[PDB]
Structures are given as structure tokens and as C-alpha cells.
Amino acid sequence: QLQLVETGGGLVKPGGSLRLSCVVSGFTFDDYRMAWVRQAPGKELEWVSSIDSWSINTYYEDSVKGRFTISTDNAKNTLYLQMSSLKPEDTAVYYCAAEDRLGVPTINAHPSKYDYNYWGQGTQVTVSS
Amino acid sequence: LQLVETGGGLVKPGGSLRLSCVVSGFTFDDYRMAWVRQAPGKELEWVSSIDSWSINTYYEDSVKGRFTISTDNAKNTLYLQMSSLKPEDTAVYYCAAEDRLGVPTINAHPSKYDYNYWGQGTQVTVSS
Amino acid sequence: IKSSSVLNMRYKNDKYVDTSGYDSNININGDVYKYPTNKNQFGIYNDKLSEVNISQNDYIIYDNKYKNFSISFWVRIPNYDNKIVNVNNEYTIINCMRDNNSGWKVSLNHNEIIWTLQDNAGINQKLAFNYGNANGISDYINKWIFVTITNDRLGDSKLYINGNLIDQKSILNLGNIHVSDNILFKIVNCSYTRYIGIRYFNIFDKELDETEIQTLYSNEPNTNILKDFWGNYLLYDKEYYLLNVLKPNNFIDRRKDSTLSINNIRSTILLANRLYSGIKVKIQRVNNSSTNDNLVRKNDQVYINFVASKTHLFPLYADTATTNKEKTIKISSSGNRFNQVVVMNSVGNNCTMNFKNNNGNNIGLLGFKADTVVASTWYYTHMRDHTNSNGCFWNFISEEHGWQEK
Amino acid sequence: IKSSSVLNMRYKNDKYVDTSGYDSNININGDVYKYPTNKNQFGIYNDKLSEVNISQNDYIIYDNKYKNFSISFWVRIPNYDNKIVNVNNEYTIINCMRDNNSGWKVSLNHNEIIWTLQDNAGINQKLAFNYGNANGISDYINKWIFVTITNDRLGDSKLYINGNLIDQKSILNLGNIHVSDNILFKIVNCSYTRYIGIRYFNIFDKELDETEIQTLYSNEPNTNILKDFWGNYLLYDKEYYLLNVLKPNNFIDRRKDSTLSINNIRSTILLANRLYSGIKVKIQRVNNSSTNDNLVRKNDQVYINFVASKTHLFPLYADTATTNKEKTIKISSSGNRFNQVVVMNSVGNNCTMNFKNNNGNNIGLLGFKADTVVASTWYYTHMRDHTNSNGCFWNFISEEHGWQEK
Amino acid sequence: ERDKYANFTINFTMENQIHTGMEYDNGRFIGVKFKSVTFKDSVFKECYFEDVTSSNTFFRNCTFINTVFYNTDLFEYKFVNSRLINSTFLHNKEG
Amino acid sequence: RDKYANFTINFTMENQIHTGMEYDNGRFIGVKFKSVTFKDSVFKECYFEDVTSSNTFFRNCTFINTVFYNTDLFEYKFVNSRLINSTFLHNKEG
Ligand SMILES: *[C@@H]1O[C@H](CO)[C@@H](O[C@@H]2O[C@H](CO)[C@@H](O)[C@H](O)[C@H]2NC(C)=O)[C@H](O)[C@H]1NC(C)=O
Ligand SMILES: *[C@@H]1O[C@H](CO)[C@@H](O[C@@H]2O[C@H](CO)[C@@H](O)[C@H](O)[C@H]2NC(C)=O)[C@H](O)[C@H]1NC(C)=O
Ligand SMILES: *[C@@H]1O[C@H](CO)[C@@H](O)[C@H](O)[C@H]1NC(C)=O
Ligand SMILES: *[C@@H]1O[C@H](CO)[C@@H](O)[C@H](O)[C@H]1NC(C)=O
Ligand SMILES: *[C@@H]1O[C@H](CO)[C@@H](O)[C@H](O)[C@H]1NC(C)=O
Ligand SMILES: *[C@@H]1O[C@H](CO)[C@@H](O)[C@H](O)[C@H]1NC(C)=O
Ligand SMILES: *[C@@H]1O[C@H](CO)[C@@H](O)[C@H](O)[C@H]1NC(C)=O
Ligand SMILES: *[C@@H]1O[C@H](CO)[C@@H](O)[C@H](O)[C@H]1NC(C)=O
């Protein structure tokens, strides 16, 4: 039953606002740190943001802080990324990921697949004039 | 190479206390055993010492008469019979082992390097 | 002599001896097993003649009304298949009771340890500890358990298990206690065939306090030597399954890409996690010498080998060829060790493995991140007081007759 | 004395000569090593042509039955890894026996020195000294050993090692000895490739008494120059390991707070302590003018430098910023010497380092208190008669080829 | 073509610096705290490090020869595509 | 008859026919077999890992205490062969 499905990614004008929803199944958010990770067209994966829900704690890549806002909802069991003030080079495929809370809590900027227990399918986010 | 102290408690002026230090890793043939007290706000103060090979025991100018250092015949348990307790005795009390082959000086205000092994300490409180 | 210790049963040159100073005699009758790695530990059976008899020195035989006294030992109780032992019947393993049942007794029952103290008038008090069936991982079954009983004759009899007080009852109603001249280590009236391990039997002529009991518990087994899951000495060139202390319901498996996975839930037999699951490892000395024993000690430089089969061992290394701070542990199919070494250490019964370069460079303690076994420097500064601290603590499980699972 | 010296092998003018005045000829054949700091010491090999031949003057060749005579020299015998030499095979080093093996011989076995005296008839008598394998610190292996042999024709032949008699056998049954014209320093019939060191070879035409042998033992190496562990001259700008005479089973290690610990137990290789463990020091001249010597002499003013790496030296100083009477020795990372000097001195082969203030004040001899290396004035008044007296004595161990440990 | 510096002792904090194509010969770093420092294409010849803490500090495509690190936190992950020839780490901070 | 032992093959083997061999503790890790045949050979305590095969067979061979981990060496590739205490683990099925 372990699965993560992302929705809400699309095309919005530079300076717009998007609301990605990662609907997860098979685990609770009190057992897993949640993360949004972007992949540029051809570049290596780039960690965007993470959240610890058991005690409200947000982590933002410097280029992200203040604009985006990661949130969780144990009601509806859904992770949210409230994007806003979108810039041109935030265009990428955006995956949600779940990391076992009990493991080494480091945040690698360019993760590989073994940085997270579970990955999603990803939603495309394009931003062009 | 460990020392563990016990026997510390809360007493009234004139009461009695028997502190014990159990050792593991060495006997008292190759080490001189010592009691050092830390009073709140003060620096470490040397209390007593015993030469187990000899019959030589040392006491700080004050303590002597009421406090008696001893060791067992197995040479691995250190005692300090504390009687006629005064309230300025109130301190944490540590057992310490000095290598006997070293310089036999006894500094009254020792640092960590004056002894090989220090214990965990046991609290002695003299309250009215 | 002159110590609180009036009896200390220890091993010297093929027999058991009293090292206290009061010179009590210790005799072995029949087939008593001696543990080769630690001969202070002995095994007694009940399917043949197997006993140890301590003739106490008359000077130390307890015959007072007010003299405090304490008893300490470690016991090892296999449950075999958890089924043959499932019978409610109290059976004796240590007897210091006279013909009138005066003195003291250590007995066992199904996952239970019992202490009985009786006076000359037949007035008794019993203390007990029921550790019960394994719910996940058991800290007692087939493990060395430290038993301590203190007796203040103007107060309570106290029973400590592994340094922790779990039972106490007043003995103020007991008068003169006259123990047996003999202490008999013998499994008496067990309805099934079994063996029992005993080690470090001590009698003290005082009531031990929590500090002295915890000191015995910490220091009686050699702190310099690492322990296995059962509490015996950790050994070189011995196959071991792995247990992560922070993830007791999980076992380590191999992936096709040579990485090690931790996202494998243990099967249960009733409520007991399977112990004999996952990969096997072997610890190998780096600086091998025919003077060294097979005991793994603190700060030993070693290699950790993955056991693909009985005759095929592959070195486990830290894959440093990545941008991540944490390095995934990999199996080396080529036998290359990649100029790496492992430093062993321990906190109590828990083991740590520090992956380092031959030049002395720290790579990290063995732990996990997400679903993969890694080496991480994070643990260096979070050994305590953090939720994830115990992810760098490992137990080495040896497949033994005392714990069976089909 | 010198009135009795009929042969003295000494280094002079590019070669070895006889200074006795009886004009014996000395020839070097092949590759003979000359010690740069003492060219009276030479090494002979057995893997290539390497020998020293002394053609004795016709007047000094022993051809009597009643003449008392003595032979004196020092020998240096490396064991390398202590296994290559483990073989029962008596090999000769000094040969003064004719075609019919009449004369005398010095031969070596594993950790053994053998003296042989054979008469014209063929009757022989042997003495021997077996110093055995290193049990902690060996006083003989790869060190200079002073061998003396006195021969009273109306009594016993006696063998002295370092001035102490160790074997005496009567030689009354020996008649006429006609020794060889040549004295050959050469390693003959040795199972393995090795080298041997010889120095101060002397022949006397009397039986030396214990007093004369002790005068030779004390005065032959320069008493003004300090000695290293092996018995060679102590040098400036040479890396040395430290050995404390009172704690031979301990070495010195560095602490992170820049202090020096002595609570490190030396590892063993089959009862032999590791000599190449701990910190390295270098002795530096305070006033390096045109002093054409790298030799350390009595009452020299020096700096003792700690060696972090080959090219990184830091001053060792006495931290006088303490209320304690004894002062901890520290490493100065800044290069500050803190206005101190060290005065070198010696008692035989044992070295003393007196830390002093530049104003002329005493800080103390280098010793130890508890587990830390310190400077203490206590030694000044307890240098001879005390249990702890030898705590101020040090040996300087040079890492060399003749002592291998891995 | 590397800017050379030799026989120097550094005993102060180094913050927010990139050093590219440098050759340090017999350099001493004693009691130095590194903060966001990056050495690129640099060679460390017979250098010495003591009592060093490091934060966001890396050595990228660097070469170390006969260099000693005593009482440092310079763990393996700080050496990216670097070569250590006869370079030793002794008594690491928390190791 | 020709005994090779304590070896490891990490390379492609193409268009070969090995006959009368007795491999003891041999390792076949990452090997790609292409038109290779083993005839009247003995595999003694050998180990296979990450092995892909094509037109490859073991004809009248004997395997003792051999492990096949992550291989495609399915049942049909063993013609008239004996497999004694040999185990297949995590095959390359899908
Ligand atoms: C660093 O300092 C050392 C000595 O303090 C220098 O080494 C010497 O260099 C000079 C000239 O190059 C020579 O004449 C000396 O004989 C050398 N002495 C020693 C002990 O090696 C070294 O060159 C300096 N490093 C530099 C300038 O890069
Ligand atoms: C920086 O990177 C270059 C290129 O990767 C390194 O140069 C190579 O060095 C290795 C080892 O000497 C040689 O085998 C190659 O032939 C070199 N390739 C080239 C293109 O020069 C260089 O060593 C690195 N710089 C430092 C200081 O490590
Ligand atoms: C630190 O370095 C400076 C510059 O080299 C030096 O002048 C100063 O003395 C050093 N600090 C100490 C405590 O020596
Ligand atoms: C480096 O150490 C090795 C021994 O491992 C030695 O053979 C080599 O010569 C050394 N190189 C240098 C430049 O010191
Ligand atoms: C292979 O290695 C093993 C392991 O020591 C050894 O017993 C055997 O003799 C070696 N050679 C052969 C041909 O098996
Ligand atoms: C592959 O095997 C050969 C033959 O023994 C060996 O030389 C080589 O090192 C192996 N490959 C690797 C990557 O080690
Ligand atoms: C090869 O064939 C013969 C004939 O059946 C058989 O006896 C032998 O065991 C076979 N060899 C192997 C290695 O399978
Ligand atoms: C094969 O396994 C069985 C299973 O018990 C065993 O009896 C037999 O000894 C094994 N054969 C070999 C060659 O190991």
C-alpha cells in the first residue's frame, strides 16, 4: 500500500503561485520526514525543502526560503508545497519523498535514490513568459 | 582502571560516615590511594593518602583526628572512617590513585594530572 | 579478606576456587560444562550427573538474626523452542537450605526467577521476576541476567535484575536464619531436560546499595572485551547475524547493487521477532598474530566480511565515491578492501563499528539512513540524548542450540 | 694498564693501526663499515667480502705455557626481527687459530658469545655467555657488549661481560698454545646474512683484575659524551624515542592539551617490548657556533624539541604557570621556548635533562608524577637511594636496521 | 603555475574564502576554525594541522604529500577528488 | 581433471567450450556468457553473481555446494547435470 502520488504541477506565469499535493498511502507522517526534490531538464536531483511534522520544523534550500511553504495534513494524510512568487528556473519535475525519521537526519543538496525510503512519480512544473 | 565511591550521605554536626572506594584493574601495591574533597565554590582540596606497601598514612592539617584512611587485606578496597563531622566538611569526596613510582610530592590544591585515576565522587552533607 | 566479599567463585587451573580469602571449598561432580572463552561461566545439566558444591568455611556460614547479607550471580536460561519450557512448575537451581528448609534458595519457573529466604521457625519471604515471553526482542531469554539479592534484617529483602530494583518485601518477621553448610548448583525437579548457565557467584556480608550493584553489573564481565547478543564475548572468525538497537523489528539484507538494506521486517513466532534472519558477517583481525586470542576488544582494528556462503567472504567497505556526507556500505565482489579498516568499540552490550581509511581518516560509524546501511560522522556528536542515537548500536547474533526457530 | 698492552687496534689516518708500539699490521679487505661518530667501531658483513686481518708482530705471538694474557673488546650483535637469528649454529667472528686450530677463537650462537682456547696438543677449554631473548628491555641485543677474557695459566680462564665475571673454568690441563700469526675479524659459517660490530680490540700480556677490567669498561668510550640506547654517542639533530628507566614497560605519548602521558603500556612481540613506540624528540644546540661535533656532552645547554612530523619541531618547555611544585612538560605550538634551556648530563648510559630558567634558576629534572611527564627538583636530593630515584633517567632509542619490529 | 607560500603558521579563523591553484609548503594550521572555506587545485607539501574545526569546508581536486592532521575534524567527506600521499590523521576530534 | 581454484572471472566469455575441468571455489561475478559450453566439469563450492547467459549450457557437469545469486542460469541450461546442495537466490526473472 506504500505509494506517493503528486498533483497540482502545471504552467503558471513568472511570479505565480502553485499548490503541489503529495497524497501518501501506507505510512503516517509521525514516522517519516517529508521532502520535495526537483529535477532540472537533464541536471542532477536538487533537494528543495523538507518538513518534520512530529515537531513543526521546516528546512528550505536558500534559493527557496520565504517564497515556498511546505506543510502536512495528518487529516487527509497529505503533504503540501504552497509555491508562490515563481521564478523562471524553478521549472523542473517535482517529486515528493519520505525519509525514515530514525535514520541519520542529514540533508544532502543533490540526493540519490537511497537518500529517501519512498519516492513519487513527480509532477512537471513549467514557468515561461 | 576504575574507582567507584559510596557511603556519602546527609549528617548532623558530630555524626559519622564511612566512605568506601572499590577499584578494578589494579591493586594498592603499585598505587598510593587518596581522598580529595571539592567544597562548593572552592578548588580541589587533598584530604588523605595511604601507602599500602608501608604503614605510612598522610592527613591534611585540619581533618586529622576525626578522619581515618584504611585499606583491606585484598588491597583493592579503600576506606575513610569520618567521625565528629563539622559542617565545613560538606563536599563531594573523590578517591584517587597515584602511581607510587612517580615524584612523591603531595600538593594540597591538586589538578587532574596529580593522580592517575579519579572516581565519580560521593556527596557528604553536614546540616543542622 | 577484610572485604564485604566473604565468597567469590572464580576459575583457576582446571577447577573453581574461592578468591575471597576465607577459603571455602568448591567441588565439581559429573559433567559440568566450562565456557572456553570465559571459564568463570559454567553449565549444569539435569539429564545426567552435573552439579557444583561449595562447602562454606565455618567462619562465613550465616547464623545470625541482624547481620545484613547480599548474594550476586549471573544466570543464563535457554528456552530452546519456547514450547518445551511452557510448564508452570517451580524448580531449584541454587540450594543453601538446611534439612528444616532454613536458609535461602534460588529457583526458576517459566520465564521466571525466584528467591526464597526462610528462617529456623519456617517463616519465609519470596521475591520473583517474571520477564515473560519475547515481545519483539527479549533482554533475558538465553541471555546472561545479573541477579542480586540484598537482605537488611531490620527492613526489606531486595531483588535487582541487571542493576534495576524490581521486587522488595519486608523480612522483619524472620528471626534466626541458619543457611546450609553447602551451596548446591544443581537443576532439581525440572519436568523437562535442560541446562542452566551460572557465573560470578558472590556472597557479601553487607546490604549492597544501588551504586555497588551497578558497579558489579558494569565491571564483572570484562569491559575491554565486546559482547555478543547473548552476553558472551564477541569472537573473531565467527558467523553473526546483525541487529540494529534502534530498529529491533528489522533485519539487514543484501541488494543486487552490493548495498545493504534495512527495510526488511522480521517475521514473528507468536510475538517473538526471528533472530536468525538477514546477512551473516565475520570479524577478521587486521594485524593477526598467533599470540592474539579470538576475543574482540575495544579499539581493535578489524575487517567486517559479508558471508555470501560458508567458503565465500567479501569485504564490506564504505563507498566514498559520492557527493553525500554519509557513505553507503557496499559488498566488495572483487575482494578489494579499498584501503579501509574498521575500529570496534562498545557502550555496555551495544557495539559500534567506525569505518576509517588506512591513513587514519574517519569515514563514519556504521548506522543507517532511509532504507540503506551507511557510515556517518553524525553519530560522533549524537551518541546520546538524540532520538536517532541508537542507530549506530549493533548486536551480533550467534546461531546457538539455546535459541531454536524453524 | 698500558705497560701490559701488547696490541691496541685504534682508528687513525683513514685506517686502523696498532698504538701499542709493537707495530702489528692491520688490513681492511672489502667493505668494512666505519661508524661516522666513532671510527674506532667497525662493522663486518658476510654477504660480500668484508674482513679485518691483524698480522701480529713476531714478538707478541703467544707461544708459552705459563704466560698470563688477557683479550678485551666490545661486540654489537643485531637480532633484526628476532626470528632470522633463531638457529642453533655456532659461527666464529674472531679467529686466531693456526692450520691445526691451535690458539683462540671468539664465536657467536643465537643470543650467545663463546670463547675457545685450544693448545698445540689439541686440548681445548670454552667459556660462554647466553643473555637470552628480550624479557621487557634487553641490555645486550643490538647494544655494545664489553667482552673481557683473562687467562691465568696456573689457574682459571675467566670471561667478563660489562666488567662482571660470568664464567670461569680451570686451564691447568692446557700445555703450550701457539696462536695464529693473524687475528681475523670475519663472520664464518653463519646460516643467515648478517653484520657484526667490533671496537677497542686489545691484547694484554697479564691476567687483568676486576679493577683494571672495570677501568676499561668505564673509560674506553668517552665518559664526557652521552650515550644512546644502543651504547653509541648521543647526537644533535637526531630523532629519538624515549625510554624511562623506572618505567621500561611504558612509553611517552602526546595529549591534545600539549602535555605528555606515561600511562601507555608498550606492546610486546613474544615478551620483547616495542622500542619504536611513542613520541620522537630531537636535541638542538642552544649556541651552534663552529662546534665541529653533533655529539651531546655532559652539562651541554640544549633544547629538547618534540617531532610532530619530520619537518615540524616544537619546543618542549616546563609550564611554570601552576601552584604545583612539579611543572608539567608541554609542547609549544607557537615555537616559544618560554626563556628555558635544558642541561644534559649522564650517569653511565642513563641520561638526565635539567629544565632551567635562562636567569640560572632550576625548574627540575625530567621525570614523572602520576601519569604525566613533569620537571621536578625532588630528584636533586633523591638521585641514588630511593624506590623512585631512577624516574629522572632516560634512554634515547634511534630507529635502526639492526632492531626490526613491525 | 601555483602561487607558492612556505614556512607559515596560521592560528586564526578563516571565513568565506576560496583558494585556487595554491602550493603550501611546510604550512602550519594550529587552532584554526574553518568556516565556508574551499581549497581547489591546491598542493599541501609537508603541511601540519592541529586543533582544527571545520564547517562547510572542502578540499576539491587537492594533493597532500607528507602532511599530518592531529586533533582535527577533517573527516573523509571533506576531501573531494583529492589525493593523500603518505598523509596521516592522528587522534581525530570525536572519532 | 584440469583443476583451477581460488579464482574470480569479471569479464565476458564468448564462443568457448571448456571440457574436463574441476573448478574449486571459483567466482563468476558480472560475467556475460555468450555461446559458452561446459562439458564433463565439476564445480566445487563455487559462486555465481550478476551472470547473464545466452546460448550457454552445462552438459554432464556436477555442482556441489554452489550458490547462484542474481543469475539467469535457469533449469533448461543444465543438461544431464547434477546439482548437489546447490541453491539459486534472487534470480533475474522480473
Ligand atoms: C623553510 O625554512 C627552512 C629552514 O628554516 C628552509 O630550508 C633551508 O633552505 C636554505 C635555502 O633554501 C638552505 O640553505 C638550508 O640549508 C635549508 N635548511 C634546512 C634545515 O633544510 C626552507 O628552504 C624554507 N622553505 C622555503 C624558503 O620555501
Ligand atoms: C586537478 O585535476 C587534474 C585533472 O584531473 C589532475 O591532473 C591529473 O593528475 C593525475 C595524477 O597526477 C594524472 O594521472 C593525470 O595525467 C593528470 N591529468 C591532467 C589532465 O593533468 C591534477 O592532479 C589535479 N590537481 C591537484 C592539485 O590534485
Ligand atoms: C598567532 O600568530 C601570529 C602571527 O604569526 C603571532 O604573532 C602570534 O604570536 C601567534 N599567537 C601566539 C599565542 O603565539
Ligand atoms: C611514502 O611511504 C611509502 C611507504 O608506504 C614509501 O615507500 C615512500 O617512499 C614514501 N614517499 C615519500 C615521498 O615519502
Ligand atoms: C585455495 O585457498 C584455500 C584457503 O586457504 C586453501 O586451503 C587451498 O589450498 C587453496 N588452493 C586450492 C587449490 O584449493
Ligand atoms: C578482474 O579479474 C582480473 C583477473 O584476475 C583482475 O586482474 C582484475 O583486477 C579484476 N577486476 C577488477 C575491477 O578488480
Ligand atoms: C559424465 O557422464 C558420465 C556418464 O553418464 C557420468 O558417469 C559422469 O558422472 C558425468 N560427469 C559429470 C561431471 O557430470
Ligand atoms: C547436503 O545437505 C544435507 C542436508 O542435511 C547434508 O546431510 C549433507 O551432508 C550435505 N552435503 C554436503 C556435501 O555438504
Numbering used by the authors:
A (entry chain E): 1 to 129
B (entry chain B): 2 to 129
C (entry chain D), D (entry chain A): 847 to 1252
E (entry chain C): 488 to 582
F (entry chain F): 489 to 582
What does the paper say about this structure?
After prolonged efforts to rationally design and optimize a unique molecule that mimics the dual receptors of BoNT/E, we successfully determined the crystal structure of HCE in complex with SV2Ac–G6 at 2.59 Å resolution. There are two pairs of identical HCE–SV2Ac–G6 complexes in one asymmetric unit, with each HCE bound with one molecule of SV2Ac and one G6. The peptide linker between SV2Ac and G6 has no visible electron density, indicating a highly flexible conformation. G6, in the context of SV2Ac–G6 fusion protein, binds HCE in the same manner as the stand-alone G6, which further demonstrates that the peptide linker did not constrain SV2Ac and G6 association with HCE. However, HCE binds to the side of the β-helical bundle of SV2Ac, which is in contrast to HCA which recognizes the open edge of the C-terminal β-strand of SV2C-L4. The SV2Ac-binding interface on HCE is ~544 Å2, which is completely located on HCCE. It is composed of a central core interface involving extensive hydrogen bonds and hydrophobic interactions that are mediated by residues A1154, T1157, H1158, L1159, and F1160 of HCE and residues N513, G514, R515, I517, E533, and Y535 of SV2Ac, and a separated interface where HCE residues R1100 and K1102 establish hydrogen bonds with SV2Ac residues E537, Y557, N558, H578, and N579. On SV2Ac, all HCE-interacting residues are located on one side of the β-helical bundle, and they are all native SV2A residues except for two amino acids located on the SV2C part of the chimera. In our structure of the HCE–SV2Ac–G6 complex, we only observed the electron density for the core N-acetylglucosamine (NAG) of this crucial glycan linked to SV2A-N573. Notably, this NAG is pointing away from the protein-protein interface between HCE and SV2A, and given this binding mode, the rest of SV2A-N573 glycan core is unlikely able to interact with the neighboring HCE residues.
Botulinum neurotoxin E (BoNT/E) is one of the major causes of human botulism and paradoxically also a promising therapeutic agent. A widely accepted dual-receptor model suggests that the receptor-binding domain (HC) of BoNTs synergistically binds complex gangliosides and specific protein receptors on the neuron surface. Here we determined the co-crystal structures of the receptor-binding domain of BoNT/E (HCE) in complex with its neuronal receptor synaptic vesicle glycoprotein 2A (SV2A) and a nanobody that serves as a ganglioside surrogate. These structures reveal that the protein-protein interactions between HCE and SV2 provide the crucial location and specificity information for HCE to recognize SV2A and SV2B, but not the closely related SV2C.
